[PDB]
Amino acid sequence: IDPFKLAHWMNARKYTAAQTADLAGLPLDDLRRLLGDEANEPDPAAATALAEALSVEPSQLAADAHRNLTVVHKSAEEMHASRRPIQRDGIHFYNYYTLAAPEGRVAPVVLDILCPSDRLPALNNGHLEPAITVNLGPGDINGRWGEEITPQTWRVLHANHGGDRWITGDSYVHPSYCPHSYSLAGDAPARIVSYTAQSNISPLMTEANNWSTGAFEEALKALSGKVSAGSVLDLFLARRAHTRTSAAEAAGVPPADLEAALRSPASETGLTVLRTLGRALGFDYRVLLPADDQHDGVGKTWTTIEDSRRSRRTFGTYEAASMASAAHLPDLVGSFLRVDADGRGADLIDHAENHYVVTEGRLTLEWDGPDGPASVELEPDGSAWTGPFVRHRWHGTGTVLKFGSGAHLGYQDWLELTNTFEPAATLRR
Ligand code: NA
Known part of the structure; x- marks a missing residue:
């Protein structure tokens, strides 16, 4: 039972603690305790009796299964073990792997691109969510966005063949609902990351x-x-x-x-x-x-290797380069990060969630959580997730891809927070 949600519905009905208990047939001491983030009560409790009394569905009083999460991580070995083949058009078409994510949430996906260059890759159905897609290499792939093959519907997402392989390849933003698929542009194998954000039109x-x-x-x-x-x-x-x-x-x-x-x-x-x-x-x-x-082309957001190279900058202790972005999708972000030092990492604090995947090196992710300082060592294909406002840093010599998504704090929360009297007090309250 979420005490915030319970208090909200008691207030909505204008029932006191005592009245709520009597209506629900429950001990008052139990309800006073339920107004206290976690105790034992809720599970064998009557969430059911409280729901009936407050005229709500039990899920309107339910607490989220994530509580106090800060960082979730997944080793390269665990990522490799997640492998699932996808058959399409009579062939082994992709392998898909899941990166780190809180349990239940949408995990970022890595794909092996296995449809060969001499087969036109059959399309999927499309999905509401927008995504950033980046070629990890080592091979060029074809991207397909339509039935008919034209310059607007068929374009090569290059992999970086040069130096500066911390910039792995071309990237772009896939629009909502566009059907898409990929094949190899030639003989060299390739992998992609497809990173979706929450759709803000979903609610x-x-x-x-x-x-x-x-x-x-x-x-x-x-x-x-x-x-x-x-x-x-x-x-x-x-x-x-x-x-x-x-x-x-x-x-x-x-x-x-x-x-x-x-x-x-x-x-x-x-x-x-x-x-x-x-x-x-x-x-x-x-x-x-x-x-x-x-x-609705992919031309506007398309970001080449050279675009990302030209974007290079120092960001605290890191070197950063940009992946594709879209001003219509402010809550979807992607960056390549180069890490190069044993301690003294610039602190990262972001205003929403991050998902990271290591592409080179044995890197150390540090964070400050409910149990004090914590750290994990990740090799290539290892990954992590950080909650909003979780302070963290990377040490080591290597490369990591940084993705970002999340409704909170998202650009629509920002609009409201600028209309709020003393937002920090409201949140504290
Ligand atoms: Na746009």
Whole structure:
């Protein structure tokens, strides 16, 4: 039982501790203790009786199985032992291996690319999640993103043949739902990492699936065409039983200045008009500003070896180079990291989760956890996961790939945290 969730539902019903206990048929002392992160109670407890009393499903009071996780790690031997062949199109098409992840969560995947160069690789179905895909080498592979073979649907993801093999190969971001597959570009073997992030539209979709079909169709219509500052603003105004005319009046804004602002929301007139309207009507103007037009090719995010080389920089004690990124997918990140020292590692603290895989060297990952300082030694194909805000560092001489994903803190939490009075106190509270 999550005491945060229990307290929330007691407050929602306006029941006291005593009333909740009586309603549920439970000892009060047990409920007072349940308001205390972990004790023994919950399991043989009546999560069931509390659920019934508070008119919720038992899972709405359930505590997460992860508690206090900081770091999870998986040795090269364990990774190799995870191997699963995938048959497709009559052949042994891939091997797939799982990297470190908390139990239950989505594990990053390494694939052996086994479809030969003289067979067109049969497509998969696609998936909601966006992914960063990087070629580990040693061989070039073909990427396929469509039925028909064209420059837009078939392109070589090169492996690095040169020096600076800590930059392993080309990378790109796969768009949501695009079917994809890979074959070898020639005779040399190859592996890839495919790293997915959480879809941030997933919570919406989950709820929308449960809407009536009528309401679903109305939602789609609302979202069709270009989703512009104007189309969005008009839904905000309808929400508040306003028209463009009444809204402009309430905010002290001339009609023509609102129209001009909707034509160029990121202009100087634009931002000030929208902000003045948001203040007056109770909305956040930031969500009306432009993001980039979208482009469903892989051309825009595609990142070559040479791109990554040109990106090289010192990052504390590390050397870093960029993998592909997409400004429409702010919570998905990938970097190549070169490590080169025995102690004194620059502390890494990230605002969400990391997944790491070692590609060269016997590296040491250190962290500060609930039991004090902790460390693990990882060889190539060894991997780790770090929770948000877990302070850690790498020592040794080697290379690691650093991936990042996570809803918390993600870019949508950032937007809200900027609207929050004293966010740190709220969290402490
Ligand atoms: Na994009």
